[PDB]
Amino acid sequence: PLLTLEEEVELARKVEEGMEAIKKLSEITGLDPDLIREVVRAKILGSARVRHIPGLKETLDPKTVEEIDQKLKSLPKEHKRYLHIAREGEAARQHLIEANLRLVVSIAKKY
Amino acid sequence: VRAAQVEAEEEGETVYLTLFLEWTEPKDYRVQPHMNVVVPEGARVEAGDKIV
DNA sequence: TATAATGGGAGCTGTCACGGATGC
């Protein structure tokens, strides 16, 4: 279905704040914001999609993403909060794209 | 409004009641579509805490 | 890089002669 202005602004906000969360989380952990992002994304989408990303320096597999996710679960409450923020962000992103998929068709029908 | 503690001074044909009262006064707030609520249902707030 | 814009079109019509697969 199509988003109301409210739903749209909400999803957008959740996405932005999610990215911010990943940044702060990388500051805390000292890990790579990319690796972190791919791990959060992985867990949101599930193990249905797991593949090595060209930009990553490590091969991304359920073993390594479980290691990283476990080290993310070992954070204190205020720090472990940013993880939940990240996950919420990713979910919001997916729902946003899927929501706005119609606009693409309406634009491309003219091409 | 409810009366917690009730004190009474007897004077002449009358009584003067000092009442310790506790009640709640409502204040409405209008939320615009660009705003988001940071507080759950029935949660307690203080001075300085943000509702929206 | 920023008004807002949210489901596509063209089909194309005078052959049987069927073969095996699929359906009340």
Side-chain angles (χ1 to χ4, degrees):
Chain A
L2 276 178
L3 305 179
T4 324
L5 182 51
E6 299 156 329
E7 310 181 327
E8 182 181 313
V9 178
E10 191 199 24
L11 289 171
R13 169 173 58 82
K14 293 181 178 304
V15 171
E16 189 168 322
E17 293 172 354
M19 291 185 62
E20 297 174 4
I22 303 185
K23 284 302 178 188
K24 216 67 170 62
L25 225 163
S26 179
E27 278 191 352
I28 299 170
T29 314
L31 258 49
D32 193 45
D34 293 274
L35 175 62
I36 297 179
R37 192 195 66 258
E38 290 288 333
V39 166
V40 181
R41 183 180 293 164
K43 282 300 179 178
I44 290 293
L45 294 169
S47 66
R49 194 173 315 180
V50 275
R51 209 202 63 185
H52 169 54
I53 313 299
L56 272 55
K57 300 185 302 177
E58 312 172 6
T59 63
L60 209 64
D61 61 317
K63 159 234 184 183
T64 302
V65 318
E66 194 56 36
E67 296 177 357
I68 297 302
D69 196 42
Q70 284 298 340
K71 290 212 306 181
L72 293 180
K73 290 181 181 299
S74 54
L75 288 187
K77 182 179 179 178
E78 70 282 1
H79 287 1
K80 198 177 177 182
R81 165 187 178 89
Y82 288 153
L83 184 67
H84 307 82
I85 310 297
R87 302 282 194 97
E88 189 65 59
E90 280 292 342
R93 166 171 173 243
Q94 314 288 305
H95 189 14
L96 185 56
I97 306 182
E98 276 175 330
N100 286 283
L101 283 189
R102 314 168 164 249
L103 187 66
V104 174
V105 163
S106 57
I107 299 178
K109 74 191 171 210
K110 297 177 293 181
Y111 285 79
Chain B
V1 56
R2 176 188 49 88
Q5 307 167 18
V6 173
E7 294 176 328
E9 284 182 334
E10 303 263 8
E11 195 185 14
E13 297 187 87
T14 67
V15 262
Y16 190 63
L17 302 157
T18 288
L19 268 20
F20 292 97
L21 297 178
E22 295 175 336
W23 71 103
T24 53
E25 290 190 3
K27 184 172 184 179
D28 285 347
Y29 292 92
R30 181 59 72 185
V31 176
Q32 291 301 322
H34 279 192
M35 313 174 68
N36 53 284
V37 183
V38 209
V39 176
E41 166 68 27
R44 289 189 178 270
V45 300
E46 315 299 313
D49 293 13
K50 69 194 304 178
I51 307 167
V52 180

